[PDB]
Amino acid sequence: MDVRQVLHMKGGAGENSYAMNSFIQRQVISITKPITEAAITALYSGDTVTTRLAIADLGCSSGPNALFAVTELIKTVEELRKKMGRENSPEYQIFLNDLPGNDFNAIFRSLPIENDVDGVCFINGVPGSFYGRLFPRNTLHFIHSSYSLMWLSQVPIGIESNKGNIYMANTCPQSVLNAYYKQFQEDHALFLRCRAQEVVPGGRMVLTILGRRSEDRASTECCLIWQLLAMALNQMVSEGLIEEEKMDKFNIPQYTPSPTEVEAEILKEGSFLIDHIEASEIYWSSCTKDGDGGGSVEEEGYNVARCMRAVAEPLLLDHFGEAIIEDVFHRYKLLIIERMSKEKTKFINVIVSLIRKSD
Amino acid sequence: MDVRQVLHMKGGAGENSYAMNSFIQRQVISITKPITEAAITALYSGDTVTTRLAIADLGCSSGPNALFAVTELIKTVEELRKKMGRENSPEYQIFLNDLPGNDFNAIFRSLPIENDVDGVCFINGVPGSFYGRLFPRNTLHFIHSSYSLMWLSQVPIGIESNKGNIYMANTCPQSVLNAYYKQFQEDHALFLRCRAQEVVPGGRMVLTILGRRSEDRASTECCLIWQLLAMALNQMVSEGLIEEEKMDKFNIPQYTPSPTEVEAEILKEGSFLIDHIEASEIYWSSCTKDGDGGGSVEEEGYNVARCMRAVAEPLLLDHFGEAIIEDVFHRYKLLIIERMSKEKTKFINVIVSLIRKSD
Ligand SMILES: Nc1ncnc2c1ncn2[C@@H]1O[C@H](CSCC[C@H](N)C(=O)O)[C@@H](O)[C@H]1O
Ligand SMILES: Nc1ncnc2c1ncn2[C@@H]1O[C@H](CSCC[C@H](N)C(=O)O)[C@@H](O)[C@H]1O
Ligand SMILES: O=C(O)c1ccccc1O
Ligand SMILES: O=C(O)c1ccccc1O
Ligand SMILES: [Lu+3]
Ligand SMILES: [Lu+3]
């Protein structure tokens, strides 16, 4: 019950939600530029990428970021082909992938409004799950992917997650719960097999999954944010609100963090090589040089909520209905604002650069 | 003034408009099956199409039809590969193209809801004008295209089209108007050049443009339907309604019919071969075995209007605003119902099958 595929996407661009609330995932893509520079330099260096380069963003979204990274690759490549590696640029063939029901219209419109693109970039939207095959065999040289690979194929089955039902969140789950991990394995390995068939032997993949360091499936490194949402909900279930305890006891984000558990999966599948694989970290700055450069009634208050709202409003709205929503984010907002103080909130970013190997 | 590219699309699927009003374009695709059978048999016969076949619909839309034809090719091909021509099927790679701002979400959703597809069909939406390049060089084996190629790049420039301003419509235009033809040439030839670069040397293209026989740029063969709309409008301009005469004197559909004028263009560009090229015709049946199998208060009344509404409501709504709309189609409706009687309304379908030649 609950088909992630048909159910989740991020709030649709234009308005205040996901486009107007994804600056943090934007900075992560920023900071991850170097790892990707090595990646495309390495791949461009010497032919495999001849007359056609085919970059593909997996789990892109709406608004900026969708094209942000696939636009700093075509950049770099062009800057090489001129400082020499070849005399002509290749034609860039882009593939923006996401689940059906993401805002492809929003991108095709308010975005490529940039008619064509430099070096000529043929853009293509590919709807579907990346936990399966999206492109023909040996079609791709380069696969980018930030903050999307932690999302799961489905919710993990066995679940007695009562209190902090929401997630793998720490304290009170009972290892029985961590069938999440058992889930991540079959999902992530099925992702790799597929990618292995479509990525050309020289091809590169730079995946950025939001995970952790603590090797302890339950830490504020990953479980807080949902815990905070859960906490917001459990108070409303108590206060009497349209969640019986029967309803909340069924909601559960379906995604999993982790760091070495990744390499653990990448080599099990003997398809990709590995490189610079690390785990960076970022603060819930969730802003920019924003007008008011506030404290918490801003920095997390609102900015970290509107983000977690554009990110989960649909999962919720679909499991509890609109009547709630307004209220759960007003509360959730406050909880993080306060939780912002007693501690320094942040996320971990297992990053991996890879190479289809074999031949 | 009036960027077709940003401005027109057909009414967005789901509701009563284009999905629920395109049965006529559906029958044309039906009747055009044979020409396409020859086309893909010829192309499948003997390798060029090895492990990857790449069909691409140009000017697809929303709802059925988008996939309708690209789904009766993958069909046919499969039926050959088994009655032998090979032991395995290729992977099908589909490209659905339309202007930005068509309903790609509607297709990606309510349509591929059919998870994947038989023989595995990777679907890709390509937003952009086909009066330019949409895919890399030598990327395509097979290009389908019904009722979209008569649409122009833009409105033709010089225009003193006062009365039946709406179109190339007969009586009262003054050959000066038929700068439409001068338009069709630069548009259609620029379509061919582009297609010529992306269609692989063995590749086929089956284009179905709504045109005419009469070789006379102005006949009920093509100019009636708009004339009828124009007629509906001119009565409202008169009746005082929110069209000064200044407004109506600027609206003008930007597309052109024709039949031999097509081959005339295809060989001028020395890129494609030609084959079975004909011109079939179809009645404004605009229905199916519909409940009530009416007469005219139905057959054209409504059914031929709702179609011409899902087809032009946007061009209008954008040139005159919503205040009108309701009223212009109520009237337009009646005019065709009546015009249905004194005569037997129908359209002509210049159809062309082609082959990238050279090498
Ligand atoms: N199985 C799956 N296949 C494809 N996309 C998926 C997916 N599961 C989740 N996603 C997508 O992953 C996207 C993650 S949000 C990504 C934001 C962007 N890449 C950035 O770095 O800012 C969501 O729109 C969601 O629909
Ligand atoms: N320059 C252009 N490039 C791509 N698509 C175009 C175009 N000009 C018009 N179109 C598209 O052509 C489509 C024609 S309606 C097509 C219906 C479908 N092919 C059928 O046979 O029923 C419109 O959605 C429109 O946006
Ligand atoms: O999918 C996301 O972008 C996301 C971002 C921050 C925290 C949890 C998440 O699932
Ligand atoms: O674009 C169409 O589908 C169309 C259909 C019937 C008459 C005129 C048109 O432009
Ligand atoms: Lu650089
Ligand atoms: Lu057949």
Q: Are B308 and B229 in contact (CB under 8 A)?
A: yes
- A128 inside 8 A of chain B by CB: yes
DSSP string for A59-95: S--SSTTTTTGGGSSHHHHHHHHHSSS-SS--EEEEE
Which ligand neighbours the alpha carbon of B99 most closely?
2
Among B135, B131, B92, residue whose Cα is nearest residue A93: B135
3-state SS class at B145? strand
- Resolution attained, angstroms: 3.0
Q: How far is B103 from chain A (nearest CA, A)?
A: 7
Q: Give the residue from chain A lying closest to B113, CA to CA.
A: A100
3-state SS class at A206? strand
- B118 inside 8 A of chain A by CB: no
- B85 inside 8 A of chain A by CB: no
- B91 inside 8 A of chain A by CB: yes
Q: How far is CA B341 from the centre of its chain?
A: 26
- For tokens 């009563």, name the residue: B16
Ligand 6 midpoint to CA B45 (Å): 14
Would you put residue A258 in left (φ > 0), alpha (ψ -120 to 50) or beta? Answer: left
Which ligand neighbours the alpha carbon of B95 most closely?
2
Tell me the C-alpha to C-alpha distance, in Å, between residue A209 and each of A63, A285, B23. Answer: 20, 19, 46
Q: How far is CA A270 from the centre of its chain?
A: 24
Among A101, A32, A19, residue whose Cα is nearest residue A66: A19
The DSSP code for B71 is G
CB contact under 8 A, B125 and A104: yes
3-state SS class at B268? helix
Q: Is A350 in the pocket of ligand 1 (CB under 6 A)?
A: no
Q: Looking only at Cα atoms, what is the longest distance across chain B? A: 69
Among B322, B151, B330, residue whose Cα is nearest residue B253: B151
The DSSP code for A118 is T
- A138 inside 8 A of chain B by CB: no
CA distance B298 to B285: 10
Q: Give the residue from chain A lying closest to B135, CA to CA.
A: A122
Burial label for B65, CB within 10 Å (0-12, 13-18, 19+), is: buried
Cβ neighbours of residue A88 under 8 Å, at least 6 residues apart? A51, A81
Which residue segments constitute the domains of chain A, with CATH numbers given? 1-20+154-179+214-252+284-343 (1.10.1200.270), 21-153+180-213+253-283+344-359 (3.40.50.150)
What residues of B are in contact with residue A103 (Cβ under 8 Å)? 105
Type of residue numbered A47: D
Q: Give the residue from chain A lying closest to B53, CA to CA.
A: A136
What residues of A are in contact with residue B108 (Cβ under 8 Å)? 100-101, 104, 125, 127
**Of residues A112, A124, A133, nearest to B124 (C-beta):** A124
CA distance B129 to B9: 12
Burial label for B278, CB within 10 Å (0-12, 13-18, 19+), is: exposed
Cβ neighbours of residue B75 under 8 Å, at least 6 residues apart? none
Residue ranges in chain B assigned as alpha helix (H): 4-7, 23-31, 33-44, 74-82, 104-108, 180-198, 227-238, 260-268, 303-320, 322-341
Question: In chain B, count of helices (H) and strands (E)?
Answer: 10, 8
Q: Is B336 in the pocket of ligand 4 (CB under 6 A)?
A: no
- A116 inside 8 A of chain B by CB: yes
Question: What torsion, rounded to 10 degrees, do the Cα atoms B64, B67, B72, B76 define?
Answer: -160
Q: Is B255 in the pocket of ligand 4 (CB under 6 A)?
A: yes
What residues of B are in contact with residue A95 (Cβ under 8 Å)? 124
Ligand 2 midpoint to CA B350 (Å): 16
Q: Give the residue from chain B lying closest to A126, CA to CA.
A: B124
- A103 inside 8 A of chain B by CB: yes
Cβ neighbours of residue B154 under 8 Å, at least 6 residues apart? B2, B3, B4, B183, B254
What residues of B are in contact with residue A139 (Cβ under 8 Å)? 93
Q: How far is A59 from chain B (nearest CA, A)?
A: 15
What residues of A are in contact with residue B124 (Cβ under 8 Å)? 95, 124-126
Q: Are B349 and B209 in contact (CB under 8 A)?
A: yes
Among A19, B255, A123, residue whose Cα is nearest residue A11: A19
Q: Are B348 and B221 in contact (CB under 8 A)?
A: yes
Q: Determine the atom of ligand 2 nearest the C-alpha atom of B153.
A: 1
Residues with CB under 6 A from ligand 2: B 8-10, 22, 25-26, 29, 59-61, 65, 97-99, 102, 129-131, 146-148, 151
Cβ neighbours of residue B108 under 8 Å, at least 6 residues apart? A100, A101, A104, A125, A127, B123, B125
Type of residue numbered A174: Q
Q: Is A311 in the pocket of ligand 3 (CB under 6 A)?
A: yes
